Scaffold this active site. Structure first.
Site, PDB file in Angstrom:
ATOM      1  N   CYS A 257      -9.040  -9.385   1.504  1.00 26.49           N
ATOM      2  CA  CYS A 257      -9.745 -10.583   0.983  1.00 26.49           C
ATOM      3  C   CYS A 257     -11.248 -10.619   1.287  1.00 26.49           C
ATOM      4  CB  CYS A 257      -8.997 -11.908   1.389  1.00 26.49           C
ATOM      5  SG  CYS A 257      -7.543 -11.674   2.472  1.00 26.49           S
TER       6      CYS A 257
ATOM      7  N   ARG B 222      -2.415  -2.704  10.434  1.00 24.44           N
ATOM      8  CA  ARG B 222      -2.136  -3.777  11.374  1.00 24.44           C
ATOM      9  C   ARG B 222      -1.422  -3.146  12.548  1.00 24.44           C
ATOM     10  NH1 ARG B 222      -0.269  -8.938   7.437  1.00 24.44           N
ATOM     11  NH2 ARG B 222      -2.070  -8.608   6.012  1.00 24.44           N
TER      12      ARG B 222
ATOM     13  N   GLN C 262      -1.027  -2.880   0.015  1.00 23.84           N
ATOM     14  CA  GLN C 262      -0.612  -4.075  -0.739  1.00 23.84           C
ATOM     15  C   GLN C 262      -1.015  -3.955  -2.201  1.00 23.84           C
ATOM     16  OE1 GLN C 262      -3.005  -6.969   1.496  1.00 23.84           O
ATOM     17  NE2 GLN C 262      -1.223  -7.501   2.740  1.00 23.84           N
TER      18      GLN C 262
ATOM     19  N   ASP D 278      -2.473  -6.117  -3.967  1.00 27.23           N
ATOM     20  CA  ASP D 278      -3.158  -7.360  -3.643  1.00 27.23           C
ATOM     21  C   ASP D 278      -4.063  -7.791  -4.804  1.00 27.23           C
ATOM     22  OD1 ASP D 278      -3.926  -9.480  -1.931  1.00 27.23           O
ATOM     23  OD2 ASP D 278      -5.240  -8.176  -0.734  1.00 27.23           O
TER      24      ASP D 278
ATOM     25  N   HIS E 153      -7.178 -11.274  -5.288  1.00 28.44           N
ATOM     26  CA  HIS E 153      -7.702 -12.617  -5.097  1.00 28.44           C
ATOM     27  C   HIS E 153      -8.256 -13.138  -6.386  1.00 28.44           C
ATOM     28  CE1 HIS E 153      -7.242 -10.601  -1.329  1.00 28.44           C
ATOM     29  NE2 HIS E 153      -6.864 -11.814  -0.887  1.00 28.44           N
TER      30      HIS E 153
ATOM     31  N   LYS F 227       1.520 -20.431   2.142  1.00 30.21           N
ATOM     32  CA  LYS F 227       2.010 -19.241   1.426  1.00 30.21           C
ATOM     33  C   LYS F 227       3.298 -19.610   0.710  1.00 30.21           C
ATOM     34  CE  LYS F 227       2.686 -15.587   4.153  1.00 30.21           C
ATOM     35  NZ  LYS F 227       3.006 -14.679   5.324  1.00 30.21           N
TER      36      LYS F 227
ATOM     37  N   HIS G 293      -4.698 -16.014  -3.052  1.00 24.45           N
ATOM     38  CA  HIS G 293      -4.328 -14.650  -2.660  1.00 24.45           C
ATOM     39  C   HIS G 293      -2.940 -14.394  -3.198  1.00 24.45           C
ATOM     40  CE1 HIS G 293      -6.830 -14.996   1.270  1.00 24.45           C
ATOM     41  NE2 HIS G 293      -6.902 -16.204   0.687  1.00 24.45           N
TER      42      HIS G 293
HETATM   43  C1  LIG Z   1      -1.653 -11.512  -0.270  1.00 27.59           C
HETATM   44  C2  LIG Z   1      -2.936 -11.126   0.503  1.00 27.59           C
HETATM   45  O1  LIG Z   1      -4.127 -11.446  -0.259  1.00 27.59           O
HETATM   46  C3  LIG Z   1      -3.022 -11.830   1.869  1.00 27.59           C
HETATM   47  N1  LIG Z   1      -4.360 -11.636   2.396  1.00 27.59           N
HETATM   48  C4  LIG Z   1      -2.006 -11.269   2.828  1.00 27.59           C
HETATM   49  O2  LIG Z   1      -2.221 -10.254   3.476  1.00 27.59           O
HETATM   50  N2  LIG Z   1      -0.860 -11.932   2.961  1.00 27.59           N
HETATM   51  S1  LIG Z   1       0.304 -11.384   3.930  1.00 27.59           S
HETATM   52  O3  LIG Z   1      -0.204 -11.143   5.223  1.00 27.59           O
HETATM   53  O4  LIG Z   1       1.318 -12.381   3.925  1.00 27.59           O
HETATM   54  C5  LIG Z   1       1.010 -10.020   3.359  1.00 27.59           C
HETATM   55  C6  LIG Z   1       1.076  -9.773   1.983  1.00 27.59           C
HETATM   56  C7  LIG Z   1       1.683  -8.605   1.468  1.00 27.59           C
HETATM   57  C8  LIG Z   1       2.212  -7.683   2.378  1.00 27.59           C
HETATM   58  C9  LIG Z   1       2.212  -7.948   3.750  1.00 27.59           C
HETATM   59  C10 LIG Z   1       2.729  -6.910   4.701  1.00 27.59           C
HETATM   60  C11 LIG Z   1       2.405  -7.035   6.057  1.00 27.59           C
HETATM   61  C12 LIG Z   1       2.778  -6.085   6.989  1.00 27.59           C
HETATM   62  C13 LIG Z   1       3.520  -4.967   6.565  1.00 27.59           C
HETATM   63  C14 LIG Z   1       3.935  -3.890   7.497  1.00 27.59           C
HETATM   64  N3  LIG Z   1       3.630  -3.953   8.800  1.00 27.59           N
HETATM   65  N4  LIG Z   1       4.628  -2.853   7.002  1.00 27.59           N
HETATM   66  C15 LIG Z   1       4.945  -2.773   5.690  1.00 27.59           C
HETATM   67  N5  LIG Z   1       4.576  -3.710   4.780  1.00 27.59           N
HETATM   68  C16 LIG Z   1       3.862  -4.807   5.150  1.00 27.59           C
HETATM   69  C17 LIG Z   1       3.453  -5.796   4.250  1.00 27.59           C
HETATM   70  C18 LIG Z   1       1.566  -9.091   4.230  1.00 27.59           C
HETATM   71 ZN   LIG Z   2      -5.798 -12.133   0.928  1.00 24.47          ZN
END
Ligand SMILES: C[C@@H](O)[C@H](N)C(=O)NS(=O)(=O)c1cccc(-c2ccc3c(N)ncnc3c2)c1
Ligand SMILES: [Zn+2]
Ligand SMILES: C[C@@H](O)[C@H](N)C(=O)NS(=O)(=O)c1cccc(-c2ccc3c(N)ncnc3c2)c1
Ligand SMILES: [Zn+2]
Lengths: 409, 398
Positions: free
Chosen positions: A93, A122, A140, A142, A144, A224, A270
Site C-alpha cells: 500500500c 513478514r 499478494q 493486491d 488499492h 476488513k 485495499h
Molecule cells: C489487501 C492488502 O492491500 C492489505 N494491505 C493486506 O495486506 N491485507 S492482509 O494483511 O490482510 C493480507 C492480504 C492478503 C494476504 C495476506 C497474507 C498474509 C500472510 C501470509 C503468509 N505468511 N503466508 C502466505 N500467505 C499470506 C497471505 C494478508
Molecule cells: Zn494494502
C-alpha cells in the site's frame, strides 16, 4: 491429504532450512503460479485496473509515518545501507501511495484502481509456519483503489463482485464471510472506524451476503471483510479481503483536486482476491487433491508408446500438441502401458494418449484420463480442439466427466 | 535524449530518496517490462528452458559456502530473524543449484536449462547510481545451464546465438563484446581458469565475433563474455553475458550420474540475454527516444471522438480493438480534437484513430501516427489486422 505431500509428489516446490518459509518454486509449481497470474490479469483488464510494481524496500522513516513501525514492528525485516535503515515491504500500500503522489491528481482520475502482484515479507514466528499457507515471503494479488467518499459503495461492491466472479471459476460459491472490526492497536478516530465499519457491513448486506463480525481482528488502518476458504482439516484461511482505509492516504500526504478546486484526501480501498498466490495454491492443491483443472495442470497431456515402433509417431504428436499451445510430454520408456498410466496418474496429468500400432496406422490416439476413464480413440485434431476449448474456458471438469475431484461438496 | 527525462514524460517509473536505486514501475513502464518478459519466455520456450523462482533471501551460511561472502560481501544486503542472518540474494545461481539438488539427476537430464526472472539486490555505492542503468534492486533475465564438459561448446554457442537472435528484434547496430578474465579474488584453480577462458575465446572466434580482452574483470567464479550496449552519451553498459563456472556447483554439492555411470559435478553456464530488465529498458528508451515499437508501446492506440455524437461509436471500436488484444484507450473528453491528438502524440502512442460523423456513417476510422503521418480513412477490420500483424511479428518500425 496435505498440500505439502502433494507438492512433493508433483515436484511443485520445496523449502530448506537455509531459508525458513521461503519458497523454491520448481518449474511445475511455477507454471501454476504463472497461470494464476494470467487469470488474475484477465480480470484486472476487464475490471479496469492499472498494474504496477513497487520496490522491495523503502526507508524506515516512511514506515514510521504510516503507523507500520508502531503497529507492525515485530513482523518487518529490516536492512541497512550507508547508515540508513530500510524495511523490506510487508505490504504494498505505501508504495502505491508513493506512485499516486507522483503528478497532480484530479477528481477526474478517480476511481484509480492500482493492482500489483506484490511480493511481501513478514517475519512470521517460525512456530506458526505451515507449508504454502503460512510462509515468510509471499505474493499478494493486491490492489488499492483511490476514490472519493461518493464512490466507496460502488468500488467496495466491485471488489465483492470480483471475489465471487473469480472464486466461481474454481467452483467456490458458498463462501464464509467475516467483518473484522477495530483491533486494540489502531490509528484513526472512533468516528472514522464507525463509518468504515458501517460502510463494509452495508455493502455486504446490499449484496445479500450473510456474515459474522470478528471482533478486534481488523487491520491497524481499517476494518476488513474476510473471505475464508478451508483446507483438508477444515482450518479457516483468510483468502479474499476487502478493507476500507481513511488513514494511510492522509499520513502519506496523498491528495487530489476536487470539483470545486479544493484539496481533498482520497479514500483507499485495499483488496486481495486470491489472498496470496502461495496460500491460494496450497488451498487448491488440498481441495482438488492435486487434480488441478486442465488450464492449471503443470503437464496437461502425456503421449506414450507401447514399443520403440511408435516412438517416431509420439514425437510428431508431442511437437504438434506443443505448437497448439498445450503443455505436453512424451513418455518413450520401455515400460508396460499400465505402469505408465499409474505413474502419470500419480502425477495428476489430465490426459494420457496411448499410441499402439493401430494408432500409428489411423493417425489416431487412444485416450485415458487420470480419473481412470477410457475415452476410446479420437482423431488428433479432435483431441487438440477439445483440449484447447477446455483450456481457454478454464473448465473445472474434463471431457465426458460429471464431477471433478473436490473435497468440499 | 536521456531515459530519465523520457521516463518522467511518459510516466514510466520514478525513484525517490526514501529508496535510493529502488524503482517504482508505474503502469506504463510496467507494461513494457511485462512485454519484455513475454518476449523472453517465447524465446526460452524454443530453446527448451525450465522457468523457476528462487527465494528472495537465504541463510548467510549458504553464501559463505559459495564464496559470495568472502568475494562479494560489500554488495550484499543482510537481514535477521530469530538470531539467524540472511542475505538478500544478489544473484540467482545458488538458488538454482538448490533446485537442481532436489531429486537424483543423471546425464538424461542434461543439458538442464533453468531460467528465472530473478530479482537481485546489490548495495551499489550511491555515487555510482544512474537512472535505470544502475539501480540497487533489479530483475535479471537469468538462467543457469547444467551440462557435461562435452556439452560446453554447444551450450555456449546456443547462448551466443540467443543474444544475437533476441538483439536483432531491437535492431542494435553497435554490439561490442568483451572477454573478462580471472580477477584478483577468485575461486577455482589456475588450470580451471585456463580452460574456461580458452573455451570462451574459442566460442567467440568460432562465432566470428571480434572481441577485446578485459583483463581481471571476470566474475569470482568464472570468466565472462559481455555484450555491451551504448546509451545516448556513448557510455558502455553490460547487457548480455555468458559465463563459464567450474566451481559453484561443486561448492554446493551438485552432482549427476553420467552415461558411463561415473557420478560427476555438472559444469554450469550462467547467462543473461537482456541483462536486467531495468538496464535494458533504460537502453531501449534512449535507443528509440521513447518511440517504442508497437509491440512494446504502453498504449498502442487511442481512439477519439470529435463531439459526443461519436461517443458511442468510439466505445464500440475501443471494445472491439481491446477484444482483438490491442492496448487501446478511448479519449472521450470534452476537449477540441486537435488538443486530444497533441496529447497522445507527445505520449508517443503509435496510432490515433479519429472518429467524426463521416467515420460513424461509413464504419471507418481516420488514422494518424505519433510521427504526424496521416494514413487517411481505413476500414476497421483492416486496422485491426494490420496492428495484430505488427504486434505478433514484433516489427521494428512501420
Ligand atoms: C489487501 C492488502 O492491500 C492489505 N494491505 C493486506 O495486506 N491485507 S492482509 O494483511 O490482510 C493480507 C492480504 C492478503 C494476504 C495476506 C497474507 C498474509 C500472510 C501470509 C503468509 N505468511 N503466508 C502466505 N500467505 C499470506 C497471505 C494478508
Ligand atoms: Zn494494502
Ligand atoms: C548471469 C548471472 O547468472 C550471473 N550470476 C550474474 O549475475 N552475472 S553479472 O553479475 O555479470 C550480471 C548479469 C546480468 C545483470 C547484471 C546487473 C548488475 C547490476 C545492475 C544494477 N546495479 N542496475 C541495473 N542493472 C544491473 C544488472 C549483472
Ligand atoms: Zn549466475
Amino acid at each position: 491429504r496435505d498440500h505439502r505431500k502433494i507438492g512433493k509428489q508433483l515436484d511443485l516446490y520445496h523449502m530448506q532450512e537455509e531459508a525458513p518459509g521461503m519458497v523454491f518454486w520448481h518449474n511445475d509449481g511455477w507454471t501454476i503460479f504463472r497461470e494464476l497470474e494470467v487469470f488474475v490479469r484477465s480480470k484486472l483488464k476487464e475490471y479496469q485496473y492499472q498494474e504496477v510494481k513497487g520496490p522491495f524496500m523503502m526507508d524506515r522513516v516512511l514506515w514510521e509515518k504510516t503507523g507500520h513501525w508502531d503497529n507492525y514492528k515485530d513482523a518487518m525485516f529490516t536492512t541497512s545501507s550507508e547508515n540508513r535503515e530500510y524495511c523490506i515491504k510487508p505490504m504494498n500500500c505505501p508504495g502505491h501511495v508513493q506512485i499516486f503522489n507522483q503528478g497532480l491528481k484530479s477528481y477526474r482520475d478517480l476511481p484509480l484502481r492500482m493492482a500489483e502482484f506484490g511480493s511481501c515479507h513478514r517475519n512470521e514466528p517460525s512456530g506458526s509456519l505451515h507449508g504454502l499457507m503460512r510462509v515468510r515471503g509471499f505474493t499478494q494479488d493486491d490492489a488499492h483503489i483511490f476514490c472519493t467518499e461518493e464512490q466507496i459503495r460502488d468500488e467496495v461492491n466491485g471488489c465483492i463482485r470480483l471475489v465471487y466472479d473469480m472464486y466461481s471459476t474454481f467452483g467456490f460459491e458458498k463462501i464464509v464471510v467475516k467483518l473484522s472490526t477495530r483491533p486494540e492497536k489502531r490509528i484513526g478516530s472512533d468516528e472514522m472506524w464507525d463509518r468504515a465499519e458501517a460502510d463494509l457491513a452495508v455493502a455486504l448486506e446490499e449484496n445479500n451476503i450473510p456474515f459474522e463480525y470478528q471482533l478486534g481482528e481488523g487491520a491497524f488502518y481499517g476494518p476488513k471483510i474476510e473471505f475464508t476458504l478451508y483446507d483438508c482439516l477444515d482450518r479457516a484461511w483468510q483468502c479474499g479481503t476487502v478493507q476500507l482505509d481513511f488513514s494511510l492516504p492522509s499520513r502519506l500526504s496523498a491528495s487530489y483536486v476536487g470539483e470545486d478546486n479544493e484539496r481533498k484526501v482520497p479514500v483507499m480501498i485495499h483488496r486481495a482476491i486470491l489472498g496470496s498466490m502461495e496460500r491460494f495454491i496450497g488451498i487448491l492443491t488440498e481441495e482438488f487433491a492435486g487434480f488441478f483443472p486442465t488450464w492449471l495442470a503443470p503437464v496437461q497431456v502425456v503421449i506414450m508408446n507401447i514399443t520403440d515402433s511408435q516412438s517416431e509417431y509420439v514425437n510428431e504428436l508431442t511437437q504438434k500438441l506443443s505448437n497448439a499451445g498445450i503443455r505436453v510430454k512424451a513418455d518413450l520408456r520401455n515400460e508396460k502401458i499400465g505402469f505408465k498410466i499409474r505413474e502419470h496418474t500419480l502425477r495428476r496429468v489430465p490426459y494420457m494418449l496411448v499410441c499402439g500400432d493401430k494408432e500409428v496406422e489411423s493417425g489416431k490416439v487412444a485416450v485415458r484420463t487420470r480419473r481412470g476413464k477410457d475415452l476410446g480413440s479420437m482423431d488428433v485434431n479432435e483431441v487438440i480442439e477439445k483440449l484447447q476449448q477446455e483450456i481457454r474456458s478454464r473448465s473445472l471438469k474434463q471431457l465426458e466427466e460429471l464431477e471433478h475431484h473436490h473435497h468440499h461438496h
